[PDB]
């Protein structure tokens, strides 16, 4: 009965053209053309991002929503967009990325942007069964969309349930994807986590309108229900008039090489 649940219901009722236009209406998007061409030809020394994820994490990082420091752990790293971004930051000492990378799941990509040598990728790993390890910065970008709000809720609570085990070890910084922050049980879990570990949820402007995803980050503190609903109101407004109008931005280009000595 939350605004977000209403949004999900109306989203599923849109026709093909409206859905297509809607998902990109008034959003920011990084131009991935050059990056994709470089990766497709096997270039590993141009500093291009391995996925759209690098730009998403940069957005949070550049405005203080999450500090990237010391021992970084990336749960559900996929191709490694967040791992490579973190590895290039001077404040980061090491990065451990874990991902399924099997049965259709994206496997870590091998490129040599700055600090690639301080990253340890581990595939064939279900992070829900992975024993928590002590770290300073915890990252998690897991959450598979579902046309069912109940299902998105279940998936989101499972992610937060697992992440809480890791935060309990004591972490300074975190950035965790919250697939369906609009579900009531999720809102309550977020309020509980905020009281225990601080932080709040933030909507990334690079996220498409077809998902209500927001990220639980350590760098700010705000009223969770209020801000989740602000995003619900924005998503609903954009559904009334979908123009498909997108604003293109330059993708992330990282320096290259190993971090040595
Ligand atoms: N009306 C409508 N909704 C759709 C359609 N495809 C997906 N959706 C909705 O949009 C949500 C996100 O789907 P996608 O963007 O295709 O998947 P993604 O993993 O977020 O990328 C789904 O969970 C549905 O609720 C479609 O063809 N029509
Ligand atoms: N239970 C699980 N354990 C490990 N990885 C999982 C998982 N569930 C989903 N994943 C992986 O989590 C990834 C989410 S997409 C992550 C993109 C990454 N942030 C980037 O910047 O490139 C997907 O590859 C998905 O396969």
Curated annotation (Swiss-Prot):
Residues the record marks as site: Essential for 2'-O-methyltransferase activity: 56, 177, 213
Residues the record marks as site: Essential for 2'-O-methyltransferase and N-7 methyltransferase activity: 141
Consequence recorded when altering residue 17 to Q: In strain: Isolate Brazil/YF-VAVD/75 vaccine and Isolate 17DD vaccine
Location of the protein in the cell: Host endoplasmic reticulum membrane; Host nucleus
Positions contributing to S-adenosyl-L-methionine binding: 51, 81-82, 99-100, 126-127, 142, 215
Modification Phosphoserine occurs at: 51
Impact reported for residue 132 to S: In strain: Isolate 17D-204-South Africa vaccine medium plaque variant
Membrane disposition: Peripheral membrane protein
Top-rank taxon: Viruses
Site location (mRNA cap binding): 8, 11-12, 14, 19, 23, 145, 208, 210
PTM entry text: Phosphorylated on serines residues. This phosphorylation may trigger NS5 nuclear localization.
Active site, per annotation: 56, 141, 177, 213
Residue ranges of every copy of the mRNA cap 0-1 NS5-type MT domain listed in the record: 1-260
Assembly and oligomerization: Homodimer. Interacts with host STAT2; this interaction prevents the establishment of cellular antiviral state. Interacts with serine protease NS3. Interacts with host TRIM23; this interaction leads to NS5 ubiquitination.
Function: Replicates the viral (+) and (-) RNA genome, and performs the capping of genomes in the cytoplasm. Besides its role in RNA genome replication, also prevents the establishment of cellular antiviral state by blocking the interferon-alpha/beta (IFN-alpha/beta) signaling pathway. IFN-I induces binding of NS5 to host IFN-activated transcription factor STAT2, preventing its transcriptional activity.
Protein name: RNA-directed RNA polymerase NS5
Residues of the full protein shown: 2512 to 2772 of 3411
